[PDB]
Nucleic acid binder design. Structure first.
Lengths: 68, 104, 57, 95, 262, 93
DNA sequence: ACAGGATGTATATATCTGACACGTGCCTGGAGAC
DNA sequence: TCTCCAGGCACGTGTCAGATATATACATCCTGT
C-alpha cells in the first residue's frame, strides 16, 4: 500500500525492483518509462502485462524498453 | 536482596514450595532444610525425565516434545517405569511388543 | 429487566464491532550521521587564521 | 495376494504403531449420559471429562487385552475365550 | 467521459438480452472505471445496492479499494483480508441473511482474493450473489485446478470477465472460458475439439467480445520501442556451461546464464 | 494468577536441549508429574513426622521419605544431590 | 506389440496461510528484619 | 508481623513449515489399435 505511494510521491527514488506478477498487475507505475527485463522470457502473456503497469495513462515522456 | 534458589544453586523456587508445604497442613512446624531438599529432589527428577524425553524426541528426528516420546522414555527406562507403574498417560500409546510364537 | 439487559448487551456488541471495523479501516485500509571522533589523553595542535595553539600535557 | 496371517501382522503393527483414538465419540457421549442420568438427572458434562473417560477406558481395555492374551498363550492357544477373560479378571483381583 | 460509455451501453444491451459478456482487451484504458460505471448505471437503472462480489489478486485489491473511495464514495466499502478472527468479524458483518435488493447494508462491495476463497469454499457456498466480477482471470486457465471447481459452484449466474490476455492458446482455456460464460450447453470438450482452420475461428467468438486497441487515441503514453541487448558469455559462464553440458534442466542453463554466484 | 511450573522446566530443558520445544499436553504431563511427586513425598514425610511424637518436619524426615519412595539408584542420586544443595545453602557465609 | 496421449518428475521460482514462536504490562507472594 | 519489589502470569505481536501453484521440457505408463 505505501511502497507504491512512496514510489509515486518521492522523486529521489531511482530503482524499483520487481518480480513478474507481484507488481505488474494493476499497479500504477506512470512515474517511470524504462523497464528492464533481466530474464523475462517465460510467456508473452506475462510480459504483456508487465509493461502495462508502467506504459499507462499519465506518462509524460517517451518509453524506452530494454530487453536483456 | 536475592532469592534462596540462587543461594542453594537451584532453578526451581524455594519460597514457593515452602509456602505450599506451609498451609498444606502436613505439620504445624517446618524446618529450613525441608524446601531446599524437596527442591533439589524435584530438580533431579525433572532433569532426568527431560533428558530421556529429549533423547526420544531426537530419536524420532522431530524437533518438539510429543507425549509419545514421554511414553517411550517412561517405559524404556527400568526404574522410571517402576516409579510410574501406576499412572496412566495422556495420548501416549503402547510400546511395540509381539510375543515370540505369533511370529511364524 | 432481562430484555433491557439483552438489548444493552447487543448494543455494546454492535458498538464494539463497529469500533473494531472503523479502527481496522483507519489503521489498515536519509542523511547519515558522522563517524564518532574521540581523542582522550592525546595532545592537541590547533591552528586558526590569527593565532596558533598547542595544548600539551 | 497374501497368506492369512501376514496382513494381520501388518495391521497389528499399524495399530500398535499409532496413537489415535479408536472409539467413536458420539456413541460414547450418549453412553455416558444414559449411564449418568440414573444417578442424577439433567446433568451437564465437560468435553475434556469425556476425553478423560475415553483415555481411561482405552488404557483399561488394552491392558485387559494384554493379560487376556497372556491367558491365551498360557492355555496353549491363540484365540481368546470367555474363560480367559474371567481368569484375567479373577487374577487381577476384582469380581 | 470516454469512449467506454458506448461499450458499457452495449454491455447493458447484452445484460438486457439475458446472457453474460466478454471483455477481452488489455489493461491500460481504464477497465476499472468502466466497471464502476457499469455498477453505477445498473444501480441507477434497476435500483440495486446489494450483493456485489469482487475477486482480484491482492496486489491491486487495496488499489481498487482506493479508487472506489476516490471515484464513487456513495456506496459502503467492506474489505475481506487478514487473520481468521477478523474474517469471523467480517462474516458477522454480512450475517444478516439479506436477500435480493437492500439499501442500508454493509455488503455493497465485497473484495477478496482467489486463494482463500478456494480455502473457504464451505463459507462461500451460501450467500447467493447477484453480480460477481473476476479481474485478471488468466490464472484459472487450467481446467484441473481446485479453484476452477470452487469457481464452478456459485449461485450468481453472472460471469463478467476482466482479462488482459485471454488468448493464452493452450487448447483448453478457451473451452474453460466459453463454459464459464454459458454454463448450460458447453460441457463436452471432445465435441468442441471436433467442431481452413485459421479463418473458421473468427466468427465463433465474434458477437461476444469487442475489438479495441491502444493505437486509436492520442498517444503520449510513451510509444514503447524495443532495445534487445545482446552480449557474449564470460569465460567462467561458458566454462560452467560446457561443464554441465558435458555432465548431461532449462533453469540450470538460465541460472548460470544469469550469474555464476547462483 | 493461576500458578504452574512452566518456566522452570522450560529453563532446565533449555540448558541441555536448546533447539527443542514442548507441546502443551506434554507441558501438562510434567506439571502433573511434579505435583504428584510433591504430594507423595510430603504426605510420607508428614506420616513419618507423626510416627515419632514429633511436631516438626525437617530435612531428615524428607531424606528418609525419599529413601522410601524412590527406587535405589534414583534414591542414592537424589540424596546425593539434595545433600550437596543443603550444604551449599547452609554454608552461606 | 508399439505409438500416442495421459500423468509424473524435476528444479527452480512464485504467492499465501497455519501453527508455533517471542515480548510486554503489572500484581501478589517472596525476601528481610525482628 | 510489617514492609516491599520483582518474578511470574495474562495477553499482546512475528516467524518459518507447510501447502499450493506455474512452466518446459523429458520420462514413463497404460491402453487401444
Amino acid at each position: 500500500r505505501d511502497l507504491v505511494h512512496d514510489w509515486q510521491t518521492n522523486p529521489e527514488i531511482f530503482v524499483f525492483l520487481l518480480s513478474t506478477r507481484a507488481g505488474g498487475l494493476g499497479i500504477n507505475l506512470t512515474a517511470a518509462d524504462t523497464v528492464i527485463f533481466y530474464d523475462s522470457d517465460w510467456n508473452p502473456t506475462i510480459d504483456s502485462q508487465a509493461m502495462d503497469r508502467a506504459h499507462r495513462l499519465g506518462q509524460t515522456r517517451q518509453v524506452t524498453v530494454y530487453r536483456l | 536482596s536475592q532469592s534462596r534458589s540462587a543461594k542453594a544453586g537451584l532453578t526451581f523456587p524455594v519460597g514457593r514450595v515452602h509456602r505450599l508445604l506451609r498451609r498444606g497442613n502436613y505439620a504445624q512446624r517446618i524446618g529450613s532444610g525441608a524446601p531446599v531438599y524437596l527442591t533439589a529432589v524435584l530438580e533431579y527428577l525433572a532433569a532426568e525425565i527431560l533428558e530421556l524425553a529429549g533423547n526420544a524426541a531426537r530419536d524420532n528426528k522431530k524437533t518438539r516434545i510429543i507425549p509419545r516420546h514421554l511414553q517411550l522414555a517412561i517405559r524404556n527406562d527400568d526404574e522410571l517405569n517402576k516409579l510410574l507403574g501406576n499412572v496412566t498417560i495422556a495420548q501416549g500409546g503402547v510400546l511395540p511388543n509381539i510375543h515370540q510364537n505369533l511370529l511364524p | 429487566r432481562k430484555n433491557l439487559s439483552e438489548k444493552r448487551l447487543e448494543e455494546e456488541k454492535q458498538d464494539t464491532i463497529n469500533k473494531l471495523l472503523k479502527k481496522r479501516a483507519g489503521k489498515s485500509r536519509f542523511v547519515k550521521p558522522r563517524r564518532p571522533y574521540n581523542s582522550e589523553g592525546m595532545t592537541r595542535i590547533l591552528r586558526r587564521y590569527e593565532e596558533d595553539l598547542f595544548c600539551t600535557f | 495376494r497374501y497368506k492369512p496371517g501376514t496382513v494381520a501382522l501388518r495391521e497389528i503393527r499399524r495399530f500398535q504403531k499409532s496413537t489415535e483414538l479408536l472409539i467413536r465419540k458420539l456413541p460414547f457421549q450418549r453412553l455416558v449420559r444414559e449411564i449418568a442420568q440414573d444417578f442424577k438427572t439433567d446433568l451437564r458434562f465437560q468435553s475434556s471429562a469425556i476425553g478423560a473417560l475415553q483415555e481411561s477406558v482405552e488404557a483399561y481395555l488394552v491392558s485387559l487385552f494384554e493379560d487376556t492374551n497372556l491367558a491365551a498363550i498360557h492355555a496353549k492357544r491363540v484365540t481368546i475365550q470367555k474363560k480367559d477373560i474371567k481368569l484375567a479378571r479373577r487374577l487381577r483381583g476384582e469380581r | 467521459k470516454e469512449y467506454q460509455l458506448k461499450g458499457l451501453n452495449w454491455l447493458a444491451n447484452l445484460y438486457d438480452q439475458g446472457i453474460n459478456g466478454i471483455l477481452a482487451d488489455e489493461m491500460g484504458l481504464g477497465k476499472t472505471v468502466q466497471s464502476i460505471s457499469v455498477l453505477a448505471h445498473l444501480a441507477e437503472n434497476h435500483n440495486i445496492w446489494g450483493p456485489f462480489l469482487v475477486v482480484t489478486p491482492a496486489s491491486t485489491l487495496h488499489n481498487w479499494v482506493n479508487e472506489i473511495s476516490k471515484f464513487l464514495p456513495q456506496f459502503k466499502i467492506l474489505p475481506y483480508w487478514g487473520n481468521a478472527n477478523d474474517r469471523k468479524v467480517l462474516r458477522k458483518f454480512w450475517d444478516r441473511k439479506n436477500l435480493r435488493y437492500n439499501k442500508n447494508a454493509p455488503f455493497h462491495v465485497m473484495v477478496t482474493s482467489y486463494q482463500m476463497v478456494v480455502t473457504d469454499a464451505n463459507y462461500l457456498q451460501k450467500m447467493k450473489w447477484q453480480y460477481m466480477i473476476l479481474d485478471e482471470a488468466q490464472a484459472i486457465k487450467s481446467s484441473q485446478s481446485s479453484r476452477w471447481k470452487n469457481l464452478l459452484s456459485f449461485h450468481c449466474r453472472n460471469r463478467l470477465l476482466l482479462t488482459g490476455t485471454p488468448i493464452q492458446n493452450s487448447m483448453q482455456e478457451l473451452w474453460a472460458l466459453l463454459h464459464f460464460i454459458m454454463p448450460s450447453l458447453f460441457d463436452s470438450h471432445d465435441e468442441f475439439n471436433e467442431w481452413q482452420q485459421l479463418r473458421r475461428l473468427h466468427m465463433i467468438l465474434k458477437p461476444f467480445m469487442l475489438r479495441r486497441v491502444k493505437k486509436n487515441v492520442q498517444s503520449e503514453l510513451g510509444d514503447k520501442i524495443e532495445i534487445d541487448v545482446l552480449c557474449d558469455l564470460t569465460q567462467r559462464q561458458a566454462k560452467l556451461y560446457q561443464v554441465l553440458k558435458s555432465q548431461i534442466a532449462v533453469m540450470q542453463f538460465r541460472k548460470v546464464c544469469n550469474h555464476p554466484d547462483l | 494468577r493461576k500458578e504452574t511450573y512452566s518456566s522452570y522446566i522450560y529453563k532446565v530443558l533449555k540448558q541441555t536441549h536448546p533447539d527443542t520445544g514442548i507441546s502443551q499436553k506434554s507441558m501438562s504431563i510434567l506439571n502433573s508429574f511434579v505435583n504428584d511427586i510433591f504430594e507423595r513425598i510430603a504426605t510420607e514425610a508428614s506420616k513419618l513426622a507423626a510416627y515419632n511424637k514429633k511436631s516438626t518436619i525437617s530435612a531428615r524426615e524428607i531424606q528418609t521419605a525419599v529413601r522410601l519412595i524412590l527406587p535405589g539408584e534414583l534414591a542414592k542420586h537424589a540424596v546425593s544431590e539434595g545433600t550437596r544443595a543443603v550444604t551449599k545453602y547452609s554454608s552461606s557465609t
